[model samples]
Target: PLPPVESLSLRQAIAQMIVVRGAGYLFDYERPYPQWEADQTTLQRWIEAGIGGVILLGGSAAEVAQKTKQLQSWAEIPLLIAADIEEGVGQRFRGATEFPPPMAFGEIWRTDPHQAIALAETMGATTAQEALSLGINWVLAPVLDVNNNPHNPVINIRAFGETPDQVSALGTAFIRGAQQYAVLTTAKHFPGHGDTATDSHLALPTISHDDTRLNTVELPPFKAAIQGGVDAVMNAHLMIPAWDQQYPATLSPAILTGQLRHKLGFKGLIVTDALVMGGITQFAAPDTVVVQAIAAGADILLMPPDVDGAIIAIETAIKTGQLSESRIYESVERIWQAKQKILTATPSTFPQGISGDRPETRKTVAMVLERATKHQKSLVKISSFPDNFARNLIVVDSVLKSPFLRPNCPAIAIPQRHGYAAEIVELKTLPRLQLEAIPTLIQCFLRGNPFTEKLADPIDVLQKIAAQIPLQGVIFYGSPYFLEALQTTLPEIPWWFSYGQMAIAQAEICTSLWEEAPQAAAEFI
Candidate 1:
């Protein structure tokens, strides 16, 4: 049983409402994000002072497991260990099973809805089980937003589908599967972030839709997620003028308290998207943001820019009657109830005869990949292609920070084996290739990577490359929209699209191009 909220002091009660980010690496020196992730001394002080939870990133699965054990040891109450493992634990931590983006399921749902739900369930269950093994109790996953707008920068392939029916069915199925374990599953960017054209990580975007539109298009998946027993709902940082004009959804009680809380009858925990995000922080100071988020009925203030100041501000707000002490207690009690479930419920393990990246999981991933690649197979003949593709140019969002590519990774390695000179370039610095008569195969790895704000139109880069070299078959890894746009420009170039960018995806696509002996490797590491 958790310590009653009434027994704690004002500081402790307030601390329980805040969740800060931390690197999953073991030592202080290994910490990556000094600006965002708290250092050992700072983090230990916060935990010792009774801060609520730690959101982890930047490490291996084993390292995260160790880090969680160490952090929980420092706390009197159990910490809510969370990570944005939307794809899988491997999406954040290395040495774990990594699946394709949620769009892969959406693709499957287009033809076979039943198969999509079944696959989504397995995806959710596998992710939840892997997360629990690593001591992560909260899975900030299964993006409930319907990706209605193709121009949406942040939520493009991250969202499950374009229609409410597709997203609702798949999101609810995922929630059901994830909740089967003791882990908490979150439906993110609530009230819908799917229609916004602007990336919220860079600036605040407004949802100008009226109430009826929101109810029909944007709100259905969220409603379905709630009905499916989702543990938490993460509010978006966008300005929804249909509800509130002054503050964004993260700071607006009109949206959180009025719509989500009372109107929607959602009784679960309400979490704010990272307060460090430009969408929320640009409007107000760190201290003021925390106060408003709490006043707005956020159960957890995720990644507050100023953790210490946030605690102090909320405390001062209560004393000054600017915010109610009873409101703070209400959130604290809700957190207490959440913690109780974590402590009391049994942590689920892998099923019988199942291990990490076992046949069952691998089969599910292969099924999705097969469907993702099926349409483009007969369209292009690898050997009969023009000029035999001399150069394989790989364009990624970030060359250094990318989880997909490495020197020995199949995307590069298999291309090299086929005698294609492989060159990787960051999309932002995509340069006009030197004039060459040799055929060049351009493979772009594009996705909705949060906070990087690196997404730009790849058409210009493609046109520049096409002018310099003989374009031989293009391949797209992440977004279908990019592929669709490129088709209008270069209708003659044979192109392929995959919803995944993991090693298995890389291997499968590369192996298809060259009929070499397939090297056996683990589906996900």
Candidate 2:
């Protein structure tokens, strides 16, 4: 359909198989240009050199659409634009809906255990619609990795669930919905990163599961993705000793080519997880990683450590006969055809721009939060904790500058070490200031796994405070595990959750926090 491969010689055509992050000179639509120093001239040169596509990182919606069009106008071939909309479009770009994490979607049992599938499908379709509108043809989402490990630093709550079938149900529903909108859906971190303890971004994790265990646990969801006709599957940087002990999945033909393509029969695009990640780098240099990835059947080299060096390596490999030009052609043709699929499948009248933070988008996001949020029951009827330290209350938080759960009464903020997805606690430990043993409130952000090295255990800190003073209530923004951790150490007090951190969800949780006064605006905590 498109000849990203046809215009140039074999070297340039091979480079066309690589997908990368925006180089520079790209402006955020919400702000003006001259954003720091830019390399628009150099980046455009790469486009002319036949790099196939760019992944949007952090930019406004309108800015992205305009920049994408402006780049395509300058290019000989149409670029495949991709977005990581795992938690929704707002994950990377600004001013689009921020859907809850996949775990939140898993919580909506709705009496039938599938009453929430419609909302899950809606989440996918809507997010894909928003991506396509913004000129992004690909959505790297529906994390097919089965999250069976509690200590996994990454891919914890990001995966749909612990059971492969649960993950399959949610993942397939999301994929089917996204494809309807003509945006490519990706099943990520294959064969699975769900069981690893380390974060691939920080370190190379290993999955020690045998093939039998993998088939029982990790492989089912990926198999389901292939069965569902998912357009793409991303290779995880983690090592699976069962298939390849010497190399990680990204550069290992045994896993990427053997297990995934051969065993699972995934004929769709095989994308490498970011080569810049410590996981891939720990195993090999940029040249070793990039060339080996292509040899392993990866269609797209995503975020290579050194793009220029990668091109040189691939060129040299072809000349030396270590890699065949025809093999490169196979990847390029697949990419070319995939780009055409976007063209033929995307409606002529389809929107091609970034969406604003529209109020209507709030309904889908809000609905997911509404259906997923839950609260533990209480016996006492004490709503307001008054002064004099007897029935008084206090609030604790990790991020206070932008408070997501602002209580009615006085709130104490705990400084957070990590940003956005939250994994740090500023205080070496909970503050030692002892109050008059009063009832208190604490909030848990449940989406991302908050537990990590140097990450203060909130449950221990909150539990100590609750030991002296009664825990009035526990509120979770999303992770059910965070709730379980708290209830384990702390009191089994009344609890509430919004399943996400959007203001719309915050409002719903705040109103629901007050047990008896839904509308009365309880002026107390």
Candidate 3:
């Protein structure tokens, strides 16, 4: 049971709003982001000091379970453990079931809207079940942005659809599925982040739409999510001049409090996107940002750049009467109330750290891949694999850093099994291939890199590559947009598109290439 909010001290009450990032591993040496994820000692100190929660990243499923349990042991009040497991728990933690990105269902929605909604609900329920078994109480997902812009560097394929109705229906179904468990579900990037040309992770993107456009395109999914009983709404680090010209959504009262709290009538927790993101930090200093987020009616300050400084700033605000003491109590009460649901959740019978990858879940993933994979031409034309074939694999960054690839990952391994020479390259470093007249199998893993905006156009690069080398076939593992673009250039060549980049997805695409004549990939398993 949650402790009464009245028993907490002023500092404790304020600290409960601050959530920091931590690596899901056991030791400091295992921490991937030393600058972002705290060491165990530092995390334990923060929990003892009354910090609200910890957002985790980078570990095996077992390691994350152990880490989450350890963090809970350090807190007097139960912590709201969070992970950005948008696709599933396996998107971050290894050995768990990882589904295709939400856009796979968007493709499914085009042909069968009913099946799409059902699959999304299954995806959400599986994600929640896996997360809860691993001790994660909060699932930061169900991105409610209507991705209507092609030039958007972020939130491209991560979104469920390109239209408001598609996003609202699918996002609400996902929320409803997750709500079956005690886990808290989030509708993120509130007001909308879908139409921006710039990446907010690198810089603040401005939303210039009028209220008419906003209401029709951006706000419906959020409203649907709220009505669907989503436990939280994450503020986008966006500057909407129509709502508030002075401050970004993270710090703007007109947007966060007025529009979201009053207009939308959302009674759930109002959370900020990562405070360390350059989207909001470009506007003000850390102290000013934390103070304003609270004043703007945010209940959770997620991944602040500095926690101690944030606490001090809130204390100063209360001392100087910039914010009332009662305001602090209100947010804390909300936080405590959210925690109460987790406390009352029925216990899982499964063993800790065990993945929720049952046969039915695996079949669900295979079915989505079967219905979602798009083909342009027959792969049998390029099926002569007993000779010299260059397997040109392009990835977002270095293969060493990629969580998806390995020496024997299905995409590379399956092609090599049939006498294909592998040549791996990254988007940042492209070598000039002088080999001509050699049949090429191009497998590109392209997605919207939300971390940075420095990505080159895969289509342009592939066109240049095709100009030099003979193309036999192409397989895209990320964006449908890239696959569509490449088809324009190589109109007659065999092409395949999948929304997944994991090992299972790779296998599905490989089977499509080797086994099938001109057809859809209904044999995905």
Give the best candidate by TM-score: 3
Instruction: Give RMSD to native, each candidate.
Output: 3.2, 5.7, 3.6
Q: Which ten residues in a row have the lowest lDDT in candidate 2?
A: 413-422
- Tens-digit lDDT track of model 2 for 1-525: 464455668867887888867722264332322332125675677788888888766566656666777777777777888877788776656566678888778777434457567777877887888787777788998898887777666776688788887888888888878877777889988988888777887777888989899899988888988999998999888878988898888888898888888988888899998777777787788898888899988999997867888999999998999999899989887887688788865542224433445565667677777887776655543254323233323233344423344542112221110000112233332465564554555555534442232223466666676777765676666556666666556546766766676566666765554444321122355
Question: lDDT of each prediction vs. the true structure?
Answer: 0.83, 0.70, 0.84
Q: Give per-residue lDDT, candidate 2, residue 481.
A: 62
How close to the true structure is residue 400 of candidate 2, measured as C-alpha lDDT?
Answer: 40
Looking at model 3, the pairs that clash are: none
TM-score (C-alpha, index-matched) for candidate 1: 0.94
Question: Which candidate wins on lDDT?
Answer: 3
Mark the regions of model 1 whose C-alpha exceeds 4 Å error after superposition: 347-355, 374-379, 384-389, 452-454, 514-525
Task: Encode model 3's per-residue lDDT on 1-525: one tens digit a residue.
Answer: 777888999999998998999998899998768998899889999999999999999888888888898999999999999999998889988877798999899889988999999999998888888888888999999999888987677898889999998999899988888888899999988988999888888899999999888998999999888887889999889999998999999999999999999999998899999999988888899999999999999999999999998899899999999998999999998887799888877766335434455688889998998898988855354554653344545455556556888667778767765556677777656645454557778787877757748434677766777787777777887777766667777786778889999888998888667652322112234
